[PDB]
């Protein structure tokens, strides 16, 4: 796909790689099985407001 269209449907980082989109996540998150979503590995992942 393209990263310039809805961020390749990634939650975080997007890169174009062989005519297709590859998503990735910041440290403290692991890429979902769906290859789009970023799942935090602990209670205070970076860049998330502490609302709860």
């Amino acid at each position: 796909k393209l990263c310039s269209l809805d961020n390749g449907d990634c939650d975080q980082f997007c890169h174009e790689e062989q005519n297709s989109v590859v998503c990735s996540c910041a440290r403290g998150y692991t890429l979902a099985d769906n290859g789009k979503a970023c799942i935090p590995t602990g209670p205070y992942p970076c860049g998330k407001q502490t609302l709860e």
Binding site: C3, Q12, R27, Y44, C46, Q49, T50
Partner: protein
């Protein structure tokens, strides 16, 4: 911060405040991990001895959750100079790791190419600090936050009496009375992308605060992502 609003609870948890000997804040910083704080290189000349406060939103009143952390190693960009204010970035390693908690948590470092094409192309970013609330006013005891438009490089250069480098960007308003100010230096400029906030700027400098036809000048973090990386390992 001139204009803007106080951060609501948990809204600005990556904010660190640098405090001199007299326990007074004089610069901000951004929490990057349990051991590291990002700040401005130019802040390290405005005090020899300083510490790092986190979890604070109201300096006058002490709450449940604030903490002070001593500085272990100061890592200052080797190319910063007061002459030019270029390479205006430093990292600090604390003596004791932060415990993340309400109002205390790190901002994310983005991947560079994605940040360039995706974060720096947003309409606006967020800057935050306990700095002066007017050019000639006092610092705020409440932590404030402010949305600032990204401002085009050419326009910024024209507006400016000092050289803007590729390690700087401009953000803020032409005449609207909102900006960062003395005391916010070193603090966070972050950009929100789908509910996650990524470090994009470091409050760096400005001619006065919120002056008409002058913008806020921020260190361009994307130039320094590898540098911050090396500094933290």
């Amino acid at each position: 911060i001139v204009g803007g609003q106080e951060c609501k609870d948990g809204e600005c948890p990556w904010q660190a405040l640098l405090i001199n000997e007299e326990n007074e804040g004089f610069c901000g910083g951004t929490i990057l991990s349990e051991f590291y704080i990002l700040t401005a290189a130019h802040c390290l000349y405005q005090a020899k001895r300083f510490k790092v406060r986190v979890g604070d939103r109201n300096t006058e009143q002490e709450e449940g959750g604030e903490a002070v952390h001593e500085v272990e190693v100061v890592i200052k960009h080797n190319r910063f100079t007061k002459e030019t204010y270029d390479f205006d970035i430093a990292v600090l390693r604390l003596k004791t790791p932060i415990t993340f908690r309400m109002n205390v948590a790190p901002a994310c470092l983005p991947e560079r190419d994605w940040a360039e094409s995706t974060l720096m192309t947003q309409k606006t970013g967020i800057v935050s600090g306990f700095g002066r609330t007017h050019e000639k006013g006092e610092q705020s005891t409440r932590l404030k936050m402010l949305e600032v438009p990204y401002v085009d490089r050419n326009s910024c250069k024209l507006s400016s009496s000092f050289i803007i480098t590729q390690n700087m960007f401009c953000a803020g308003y032409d005449t609207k009375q909102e900006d960062a100010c003395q005391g916010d230096s070193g603090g966070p400029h972050v950009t929100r992308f789908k509910d996650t906030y990524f470090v994009t700027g470091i409050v760096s400098w400005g001619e006065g605060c919120a002056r008409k036809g002058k913008y806020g000048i921020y260190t361009k973090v994307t130039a320094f992502l590898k540098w911050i990386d090396r500094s933290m390992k």
